[PDB]
């Protein structure tokens, strides 16, 4: 037994979600439009997935907290006040696969864009679009089966709206869905994000492995040049000086070019020097790399490195998110699925399991309920950079 | 196109001397460097020697090191291989090939047009 | 100095087969490598550089690949023009060049 105490603290908690989340929206898609500089894919795919909430709340949450407090369903004897029963699952699930794709989608173009290392494009809003409709497509089932029963409170004629199926699909729905339900808005989600993630954990320090690499034996080569007894070290050291230009002008994108190739061709001028004989002409050749290392390569390489500082910041940005959407959405789960497979059919522990699984349950509903708001939480304390928009 | 042709060979005695001609045509040799690729009879292919026709600067392997000189003239746009105290050992295909300069793509092409080859025999 | 090392020796391969040889050098040489191709009695000829690129007269099929310092060239059909001697080349400079041993190529009965 659960007293109407629950009932109050639902009322108390759907008001909030409201006064939170409408505000919350309501800046977020403000500022993405607003700022001529906050307009990117990743950004387009955040304001996608934050409007995708205020037409669930601002719709579902008052018609939610009037039937959960009054007699029974708003409008009981109307003809679009039976489409109330129907549109009320259809939002929600269409929210729920909005947000999942979404993050699936942060997911795959955060592991493209590491690999392709070095203002809404065609291709995203194309993606927007297509995870709108397919979220719709995917949800009009919830919206087919709903339907009004009679029953006789106080004597009454009146209508509630349950799951009676009617056509042999919605029977076959209803004896499976849970586990469809888990498997696709739980499991998915949580296993193509995790092998994006780690293929590009993997990527980033390989990216960084070489780089580190080249310029470390073109400033060893330097040192052993620089004391080079003989032409047999000058020039074992300047194939490696050339082998590690060669390979390191490849990584650099198209200024810097211009650099690499000046390099090159005054290690070959060492070189050239080098064979004819001339240890003091190929060891002033190569001391005059001063002037092109720290005029070109030094920029190169900061840039370069700092650039990826910044990529990893949207990195773990995007998937704070996915962890934030688990933890909220993993309560529910759990009551659901203990109770069909273990479930309290007979079990003595029917004094303190069932009380217990029924709290879980019935608090898991409003956890569940609290992801449509706290996404402005998370990216103003975790962003930074959305942080500035919000403080100005 | 880009043409290339050896010519200047024959057989000659222990310890002779012979001089050889790579003609280009088609092209400046000013604009691409050359060099001497040596086969022997059912062997494999090893290389000799170079010459860059606008810098100067000419190469040798260890090979042929001290008894090869290679020089070229623009003017009649002809390199020249000259072998001095030649030995049994040496008989072999002789062929002609060009290199282009570093700043660009013809430097990555390598080797892309061949003479036609020489063959030189030592005997008694 | 920087040895190349060619791994298939002979090969005996039919009509309409997939053929693969692995080239192998001794120090940290970029993707300057390259392949010629030589029948008996004839200058070799150009069919790969910069380690994966076709030069303009070839078939598609021929193919190269760069994995660290092994190279792999590739001929996904053995059409009856493909029976010749195949060689293998590093050029990071003009006076440091060496050659591999080569690979021949016959039919198989």
């Known amino acids: 037994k659960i007293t109407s105490a629950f009932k109050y603290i639902n009322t108390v908690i759907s008001c909030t979600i409201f006064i939170v989340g409408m505000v919350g929206n309501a800046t977020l898609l403000r500022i993405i439009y607003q700022n001529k500089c906050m307009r990117n894919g990743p950004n387009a795919l955040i304001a996608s997935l934050a409007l995708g909430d205020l037409i669930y709340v601002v719709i579902d949450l008052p018609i939610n907290v009037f039937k959960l407090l009054a007699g029974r369903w708003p409008f009981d004897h109307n003809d679009f006040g039976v489409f109330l029963c129907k549109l009320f699952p259809f939002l929600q699930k269409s929210s729920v696969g909005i947000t999942v794709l979404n993050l699936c989608a942060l997911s795959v173009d955060r592991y493209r864009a590491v690999a392709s290392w070095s203002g809404i494009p065609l291709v995203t809003a194309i993606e927007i679009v297509s995870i709108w409709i397919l979220s719709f497509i995917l949800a009009i089932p919830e919206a087919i089966g709903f339907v009004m029963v009679p029953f006789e409170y106080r004597g009454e004629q009146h209508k509630t709206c349950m799951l009676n199926a009617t056509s042999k699909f919605m029977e076959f729905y209803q004896d499976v869905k849970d586990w469809w339900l888990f498997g696709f808005y739980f499991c998915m989600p949580l296993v193509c994000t995790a092998i994006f993630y780690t293929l590009m954990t993997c990527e980033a320090r390989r990216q960084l492995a070489d780089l580190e690499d080249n310029w470390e034996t073109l400033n060893d080569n330097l040192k052993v040049i620089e004391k080079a007894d003989n032409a047999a070290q000058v020039k074992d050291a300047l194939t490696k000086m050339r082998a590690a230009a060669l390979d390191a002008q490849k990584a650099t994108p198209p200024d810097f070019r211009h650099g690499f190739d000046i390099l090159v061709g005054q290690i070959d001028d060492a070189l050239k020097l080098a064979n004819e004989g001339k240890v003091k002409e190929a060891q002033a050749a190569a001391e005059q790399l001063k002037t092109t290392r720290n005029a070109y390569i030094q920029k190169y390489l900061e840039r370069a490195r700092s650039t990826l500082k910044q990529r990893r910041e949207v990195a773990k940005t995007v998937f704070c998110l996915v962890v934030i959407f688990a933890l909220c959405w993993f309560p529910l789960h759990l009551s659901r699925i203990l109770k069909k497979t273990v479930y309290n059919e007979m079990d003595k522990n029917r004094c303190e399991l069932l009380s217990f699984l029924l709290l879980m349950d019935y608090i898991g509903i409003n956890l569940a309920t609290m992801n449509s708001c706290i996404n402005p939480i998370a990216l103003y304390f975790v962003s930074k950079k959305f942080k500035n928009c919000f403080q100005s | 196109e880009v043409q290339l042709v050896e010519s200047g060979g024959g057989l000659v005695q222990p310890g002779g001397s012979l001089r050889l001609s790579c003609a280009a045509s088609?092209?400046?040799?000013?604009?691409?460097?050359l060099h001497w690729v040596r086969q022997a009879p059912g062997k494999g292919l090893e290389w000799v020697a170079y010459?860059?026709?606008?810098?100067?600067?000419?190469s040798y392997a260890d090979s042929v090191k001290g008894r090869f000189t290679i020089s070229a003239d623009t003017s009649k746009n002809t390199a020249y291989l000259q072998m001095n105290s030649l030995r049994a050992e040496d008989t072999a295909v002789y062929y002609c090939?060009?290199?282009?300069?570093?700043?660009?793509?013809?430097?990555?092409?390598?080797?892309?047009?061949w003479g036609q080859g020489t063959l030189v025999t030592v005997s008694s | 100095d920087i040895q190349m090392t060619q791994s298939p020796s002979s090969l005996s391969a039919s009509v309409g087969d997939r053929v693969t040889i692995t080239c192998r050098a001794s120090?940290?040489?970029?993707?300057?490598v390259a392949w010629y191709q030589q029948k008996p009695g004839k200058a070799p000829k150009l069919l790969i550089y910069?380690?994966?690129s076709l030069y303009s007269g070839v078939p598609s099929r021929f193919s190269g690949s760069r994995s660290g310092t092994d190279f792999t060239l590739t001929i996904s059909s053995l059409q009856p023009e493909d029976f010749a001697t195949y060689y293998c080349?590093?050029?990071?400079?003009?006076?440091?060049?060496?050659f591999g041993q080569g690979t021949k190529v016959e039919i198989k009965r």
């Open positions: 090939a060009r290199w282009g300069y570093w700043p660009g793509e013809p430097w990555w092409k390598a080797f892309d047009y």
């Open positions: 088609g092209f400046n040799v000013v604009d691409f460097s």
């Open positions: 010459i860059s026709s606008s810098s100067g600067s000419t």
């Open positions: 120090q940290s040489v970029s993707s300057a």
């Open positions: 910069s380690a994966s």
């Open positions: 080349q590093q050029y990071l400079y003009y006076s440091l060049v060496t």
